[PDB]
Amino acid sequence: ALRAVWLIRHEPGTPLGGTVRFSRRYPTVEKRAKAFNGMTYVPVPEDGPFLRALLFQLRLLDDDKDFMERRDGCSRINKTSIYGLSVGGEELWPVIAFLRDSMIYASVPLVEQALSPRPPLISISGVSQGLELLLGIQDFLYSSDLHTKLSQLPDLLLQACPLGTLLDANLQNSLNSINSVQPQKQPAWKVKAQISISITETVKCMQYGKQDIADTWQVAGTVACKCDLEGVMPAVTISLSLPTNGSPLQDIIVHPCVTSLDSAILTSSSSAFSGPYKFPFTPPLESFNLCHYTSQVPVPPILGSYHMKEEGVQLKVTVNFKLHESVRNNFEVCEAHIPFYNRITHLEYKASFGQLEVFREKSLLVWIIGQKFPKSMEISLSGTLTFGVKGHNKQPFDHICIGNTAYIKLNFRIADYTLTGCYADQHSVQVFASGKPKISAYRKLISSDYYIWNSKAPAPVTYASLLP
Amino acid sequence: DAWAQRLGAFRASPSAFMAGPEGEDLGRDLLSDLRSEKLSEQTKVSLLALSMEYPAQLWPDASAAEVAATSLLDTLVLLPPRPSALRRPLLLAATTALAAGGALGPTSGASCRLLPLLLGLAAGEQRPLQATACECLRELESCKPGLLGGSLGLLRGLLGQEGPVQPLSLLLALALRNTLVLQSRVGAGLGGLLTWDWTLVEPEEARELRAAVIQLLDTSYLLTPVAQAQLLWLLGWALRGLQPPALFKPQLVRLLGTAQLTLLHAMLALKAAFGEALFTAQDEALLLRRLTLAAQHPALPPPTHLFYLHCVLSFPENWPGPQLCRGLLPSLLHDPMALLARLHLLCLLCAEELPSPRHYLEELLAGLRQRAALDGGPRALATLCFQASYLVACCLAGQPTVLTPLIHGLAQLYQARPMLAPHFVDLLDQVDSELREPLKVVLRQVVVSRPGRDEALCWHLQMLAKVADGDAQSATLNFLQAAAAHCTNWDLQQGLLRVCRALLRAGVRGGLVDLLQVLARQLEDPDGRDHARLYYILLAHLAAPKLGVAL
């Protein structure tokens, strides 16, 4: 049971910081707060003071202050996204917030006990409820329409949170139920079997390449499906055919609508069988994800290196790559961008393949390798980058790149070739119903974080990487 | 624009406009034109939405609230018999006014006319109206305990009949909890409640309640995750002391295979309330593993990660290994606010002291220091370093082996980056004495090591004031004497006498009769010189206690 909800778009530079698009207060819950809290009650302020305080605490409003001990103090540690606001000489508690793509989301829930000792957050249901509603709004607004989505929001959530208690957290469902008008226990989030499983395995790899230090790669994957079929209770559970060379499923977690996860999925953390993939679901009007899997394969797909001998102003980046044979030689965008944090005036380069176009800022020369690596599978750049006046703040200041330490930011992508081996199968359909599954499977590859870490310089290291 | 400009000044500030001259009759007008025909659909909708949103600002007194209740009820009954869009919002607005005005009660005509109406309507835009009425009834029952405990038999019988699953389910669950608590408080039980009373404001039951819980669980398959969480939370409240939980065991075990932010918290609070009755000795291990996994799983946003990172540390034990500590231990690939959620794990692991956890802690804190020393970065980096230092200091006051490197690193970090003066002052003002003293010594040594010709003097003097005592006299006096010539602005000229006042409070007597003298005689601003004169007089002419009582 919340007390109020917000959506404040992030507006840098504006003294107010933004323009509220949603401010609904439920006063039944405020009277309940009086009755429950008692002597520890602190009222909910108006929109203006709330915005000021929340932007102050979120460190999003004029962070140039030298030191504010109410925010930057060594004694006020925020290990969770449930902040505690201080409005009108009263410590408001608890207040939730998070930021993504310049869109803030907030709420103040209800606690059914006195606040004289701050109750542990492993007890207040309202924190979880506020967070989940805010996440649902975030998914709805920026799903994929500039203002027709933000205009209908006040008429949207009222159908979902009328009087301080939520009903459904999917705002698309509020839109479906409001714009468009169930004698059985049909799920409360639902208003020719075709399924569009868009698997996506992003290969992030701090490859490093030392002796004791392990080469750190891990692939983040997901499955987005939908049993968007007619009937009463159609059954379509799809099978993904990882080969014998491929490993079983790894790092499985599921959707809120999903039924459960197998005891192996609980065990196999960071049955071990390639089949039969029996994944219970509940046919949604949403897009059910029967699992999100981060599969492992021992073979890295791409290997790399980097030396930058700081011979004065000679950042000779003698790079050297290694395209494993398992990678198909057709890259949609293999832009091996090479940002130059903490440092091109004179591109005295020697490009083996593809142009090294210094960009107009002359700060980071994004060497576009282009589409395919040479037959030598190696680029190089012995560029006498005679940089001019030393840029100390103009250049992109990245702290994970200091001195001779850096790595090439390869923003490389690939269509329908990832590092896992996903292959959805349809001929093995077993179900207690009948139908024709139109399983439009797919895949992809993205550079989540592919830093070919310079082995001629120190690199940040995780825990198990140094562990033998 | 009849009412748009009218509501603009109110939704700009409710309490400000309602305290103005025009807001005295605002509620009067709004109640008046409720049954009117000159107001279009949109104006009525907007006015009724405001009547929803702020029932506390226009009808404060109980009598006014009752009058508004009867007026709204009248205009709701007297509506034209054509399909329109004022049916549900009117009932909900009347419910809001009655509930938040405090005028609700069995001994009032307005409540006695509203409650049967909502009961009949919700009993069964028909479906949206029924849902809205059911929500209104449940909310009213929440306001006054037992207020809606009249038609429990009706819902029990008609569970398979018309009526949406979620509203009747939630209302039934809330009514069960409130009624059973009240009646058992009296000393009796349901007493046939399974088949509109107002007296609650002031064996077979086991089987009936078992039927109730199985029915609720069966109907909960349609419940959305958020409402499901609150249902299970309140049910775990109710049935902790008042049939085994093996009825709900399959559902709970299945739901723990998820990672949604609400079902996980429902499971966590269910185990933290029910305790160790249903939890196995090893099921706690699987739950801990999954919470730790979800604290760093890429497929989830940062908020879920940090929520479960806070949940794991304060995880509720049933009956009060290293690999789990290696699935969440901090790294430098962690965004600033997700490491401090993981620093306690490393302090716990390294307290009882694979590279040596002290070595990894040294490398991690060294990376944080190197980030902090980078001139030109944001303050988040320094804040990270100092919060991490505080957590380790409080957690590891008692092992000099890991603490000597920490003290040395902090001293070097101060030497590299003098702009971090306030952070150290706060840390010294918080940490316990076992760490307050050696760090004080080493940081004093660092600050007084330089001759005193730097441009960071305005940052040195703050630590000097925050640490000066009677241990190392001559070095401090020499450093301060050298720094006297490098103070041209009032800020440093006040930090310096802050140092002298700290010495004052410490009690040092000899030589200070010359350090304070030279400061008073050789500064720039008159105010600092007078400050020094006063403090020098206080030290020279006071006995030891009277200075603490008269200075």
Q: Assign residue B511 a region (left: φ > 0; alpha: ψ between -120 and 50; beta: otherwise).
A: left
Q: Is the peptide bond before B298 cis (omega within 30 degrees of 0)?
A: no
Q: Which of A331, A354, A326, A356 is nearest to A344 (CA)?
A: A356
In degrees to the nearest 10, what's the CA dihedral of A453, A459, A461, A465? 50
What amino acid is encoded at A284 in this protein? P
The distance between the two most distant Cα atoms of chain B, rounded to a whole number of Å, is 98
Q: Which of A274, A273, A266 is nearest to A240 (CA)?
A: A274
- Eight-class DSSP state of A38: G
**Chain A residues 165-204 with a CB less than 8 Å from chain B:** 165-170, 182-183, 185-189
Q: Which of A172, A165, A332 is nearest to B229 (CA)?
A: A165
Contact predicate A72/B383, CB 8 Å: yes
- Whether residue A125 and residue B269 make contact (CB cut-off 8 A), yes or no, is yes
Query: What span, in angstroms and rounded, lies between the C-alpha atoms of A238 and A424?
Result: 7
Query: What span, in angstroms and rounded, lies between the C-alpha atoms of B38 and B119?
Result: 32
What's the half-sphere exposure (Cβ side, CA atoms, 13 Å) at A62?
A: 11
Residues 6+ apart with CB under 8 A from A19: A8, A9, A11
Pick among B135, B174, B260, B431 to test the A interface (most A CBs inside 10 A): B260
Q: Which of B295, B387, B392, B405 is nearest to B350 (CA)?
A: B392
**Chain A contact for B61 (CB, 8 A cutoff):** no
Contact predicate A64/A79, CB 8 Å: no
Structure tokens given for B357: 């956890």
Query: What span, in angstroms and rounded, lies between the C-alpha atoms of A296 and A375?
Result: 28
CA gyration radius, chain A: 27
**Chain A contact for B367 (CB, 8 A cutoff):** yes
**Chain A contact for B53 (CB, 8 A cutoff):** yes
Contact predicate B236/B274, CB 8 Å: yes
Which phi and psi (to 5°) does residue A4 adopt?
A: -165, 165
CA distances for B283 relative to A168, A256, B204, B280, B288, angstroms: 30, 21, 34, 5, 8
Q: Which of B502, B484, B481, B482 is nearest to B492 (CA)?
A: B484
The owner of tokens 């980030």 is B371
CA distances for B22 relative to B18, B25, B97, B394, B412, angstroms: 8, 6, 21, 58, 65
Contact predicate A228/A215, CB 8 Å: no
Query: What span, in angstroms and rounded, lies between the C-alpha atoms of B3 and B352?
Result: 70
Helix (H) or strand (E) holding A217, with range, is strand A216-220
Alpha helices in B78-151 (DSSP H): 87-101, 109-123, 126-143
Strand ranges for A39-110 from DSSP E: 82-83, 86-87, 90-91, 95-99, 104-109
Please, which experimental method was used? cryo-EM
3-state SS assignment for residue B217 = helix
Q: Which of A129, A165, A251 sits opposite B262 (nearest CB)?
A: A129
Q: How many CB pairs under 8 A join A and B?
A: 262
Structure tokens given for A29: 């819950």
Query: What span, in angstroms and rounded, lies between the C-alpha atoms of A203 and A295?
Result: 11
Percent helix / strand / coil, chain A, rounded to 5: 15, 20, 70
Q: At what angle do helices B357-373 and B400-416 cross, to 10 degrees?
A: 10
Q: Is the peptide bond before A94 cis (omega within 30 degrees of 0)?
A: yes
CA distance B127 to chain A (A): 9
Helix (H) or strand (E) holding B238, with range, is helix B225-238
What amino acid is encoded at B496 in this protein? L
Query: What span, in angstroms and rounded, lies between the C-alpha atoms of B363 and B484?
Result: 39
Written in H, E and C, the secondary structure of A243-267 is: CCCCCCCCCCECCCCCCCCCHHHHH
Which phi and psi (to 5°) does residue A93 adopt?
A: -160, 135
Contact predicate A339/A397, CB 8 Å: no
Query: What span, in angstroms and rounded, lies between the C-alpha atoms of B308 and B317?
Result: 16
CA distance A42 to chain B (A): 16
Query: What span, in angstroms and rounded, lies between the C-alpha atoms of B107 and B222?
Result: 38
Structure tokens given for A170: 């999917």
Measured between beta carbons, which residues in chain B are less than 8 angstroms from residue A27?
53-56, 96, 100
Residues 6+ apart with CB under 8 A from A23: A4, A5, A6, A47
Which phi and psi (to 5°) does residue A427 adopt?
A: -70, -15
DSSP B409-455: HHHHHHHH-GGGHHHHHHHHHHS-HHHHHHHHHHHHHHHHHS-S--S
Query: What span, in angstroms and rounded, lies between the C-alpha atoms of B389 and B386?
Result: 5
Helix (H) or strand (E) holding A317, with range, is strand A315-317
Which phi and psi (to 5°) does residue A218 adopt?
A: -155, 140
Q: Give the pairing of strands A194-195 and A438-439.
A: parallel
Task: Report the alpha-carbon angle A119-A124-A125, nearest 5.
Answer: 175
**Chain B contact for A116 (CB, 8 A cutoff):** no
Q: Which of B54, B92, B223 sits opposite A27 (nearest CB)?
A: B54
What amino acid is encoded at A422 in this protein? C
**Chain B contact for A128 (CB, 8 A cutoff):** yes
* B509 C-beta neighbours (distance < 10 Å), count: 13
What amino acid is encoded at B130 in this protein? Q
- Eight-class DSSP state of A215: -
Structure tokens given for B252: 């709970």
In degrees to the nearest 10, what's the CA dihedral of A291, A297, A302, A308? 90
What amino acid is encoded at A82 in this protein? I
Task: Report the alpha-carbon angle B488-B492-B494, nearest 5.
Answer: 115
**Chain B contact for A63 (CB, 8 A cutoff):** yes
Q: Which of A215, A142, A21, A127 is nearest to B269 (CA)?
A: A127
The owner of tokens 């909310």 is B139
Q: Which of A123, A254, A462 sits opposite B331 (nearest CB)?
A: A462
Structure tokens given for B144: 């006054």
Written in H, E and C, the secondary structure of A159-204 is: CCCCCCCCCCCCHHHHHHHHHCCCCCCCCCCCCCCEECCCCCCEEE
Query: What span, in angstroms and rounded, lies between the C-alpha atoms of A436 and A443?
Result: 22
Contact predicate B262/B230, CB 8 Å: no
Q: Give the pairing of strands A90-91 and A20-25.
A: unpaired
Strand partners for A42: none
**Chain A contact for B415 (CB, 8 A cutoff):** no
CA distance B475 to chain A (A): 29
3-state SS assignment for residue A355 = coil
Strand partners for A322: A303
Strand partners for A401: none
Contact predicate B308/B277, CB 8 Å: no
**Chain A contact for B316 (CB, 8 A cutoff):** yes
The owner of tokens 């990678």 is A327
Structure tokens given for B141: 């029952």
In degrees to the nearest 10, what's the CA dihedral of A328, A334, A338, A339? -130
The gap from C-alpha A260 to its chain's centroid, in whole angstroms, comes to: 23
Task: Report the alpha-carbon angle B69-A29-B7, nearest 5.
Answer: 60
* B271 C-beta neighbours (distance < 10 Å), count: 24
Q: Assign residue A403 a region (left: φ > 0; alpha: ψ between -120 and 50; beta: otherwise).
A: left
Q: Which of B434, B432, B339, B423 is nearest to B388 (CA)?
A: B339
* A15 C-beta neighbours (distance < 10 Å), count: 8
Strand partners for A445: A414
